[PDB]
Ligand SMILES: *P(=O)(O)OCC(C)(C)[C@@H](O)C(=O)NCCC(=O)NCCS
């Protein structure tokens with residue numbers, strides 16, 4: 001019953017969107033076609049937060065907050081809220097959509113993470129107070145997806161942790177996104193027009209960079225994205241021989257852990273691509289345009305890349321990396337043909 | 347028979363032959379199986395029955411042998 005997605009904030013957003021009659025995965029995510037390599041690397045000195053060269057992939061494009069806001073005519077706003085205002089802010093957001101509430105891994109008993117706040121904060125969707133007086137929390141990540149109960153006292157404690165490494169105390173993302181009735185009746189039309197726009201951005205194949213205290217950030221869009229991603233990721237072929245060694249220094253141990261994490265985080269983005277492409281296919285079907293693309297399945301191609309990423313970060317075997325590269329090439333090739341034929345009919 | 351097939355493929359992934367394996371045995375909440383075991387299960391399933399998408403990789407679907415067989419049956 002609970003919706004979910006490979007990124008927990010996206011699954012959370014999907015549940016809020018459904019409250020107001022919006023199918024996030026089909027009409028918002030699925031309507032935003034995108035493909036992008038991102039790199040963080042040495043730029044202009046000094047960059048004190050640059051800890052390592054880092055590369056990943058994204059199919060999020062402009063991201064669901066921008067898309068959801070303009071498609072519904074609403075707003076997606078991050079704020080920090082005082083403890084005395086939290087419950088009333090949740091009830092006020094609820095009348096118009098909902099709230100993404102940030103909180104540490106260790107505050108959520110179902111995550112079984114009492115020992116650590118996580119590398120990044122968790123997010124949940126409050127679902128009002130049950131008749132028995134407990135608050136309900138919706139979990140948007142697929143692995144733990146579901147609804148959970150928490151006392152009002154535990155909820156407020158969870159929202160204002162001390163210490164607060166992630167700086168999530170009172171942090172709410174408010175989704176006030178209830179469309180007008182006429183807008184809601186038109187949503188598929190807006191999704192169709194967003195669909196064509198993202199396809200044009202993708203074929204435009206723009207790119208850029210920006211110098212930040214955490215390094216130079218480089219991005220490249222479009223058909224070029226996955227070839228450039230593969231060429232860059234080749235640089236991590238040292239991971240498997242290094243991981244195989246048993247004379248590892250503390251440094252080389254960190255090298256392996258962070259290299260594995262690079263590929264774990266990449267794998268979550270491959271999963272998101274699979275999820276978003278499947279959304280695009282459902283959108284296209286409902287729009288009557290499935291004849292345009294003639295059986296091409298970018299959703300399955302990215303699902304294969306996803307599985308290859310899982311095997312790689314789990315095992316770091318010698319040939320897992322090349323298998324991942326093969327799967328990505330195939331997904332890149334399906335994507336470009338799918339996009340070209342779909343855009344022709346739009 | 348699918349429930350029988352799942353239990354069979356699960357048996358060599360357990361840490362010891364001592365380990366009780368019933369349809370209701372908890373596999374992942376109980377730390378009984380690790381990430382490498384999950385890879386074997388996913389690979390077994392796409393080789394034999396159905397290519398499971400991310401949407402189906404949930405603790406609910408994979409925590410017991412009965413849930414796994416349910417997942418295969420429902421999605422095949
Ligand atoms: P592998 O890491 O893919 O193994 C799969 C898994 C289900 C064991 C894995 O996703 C997992 O459960 N990792 C640990 C979960 C946890 O409590 N981590 C910190 C909070 S998310």
Ligand SMILES: O=C1CCC(=O)N1CCN1C(=O)CCC1=O
Nearest residue numbers: 006007008009120121122123141
């Ligand atoms: O999908 C998300 C949202 C924030 C975050 O860290 N993730 C990654 C997956 N995840 C959880 O959802 C619980 C612990 C973890 O690493």
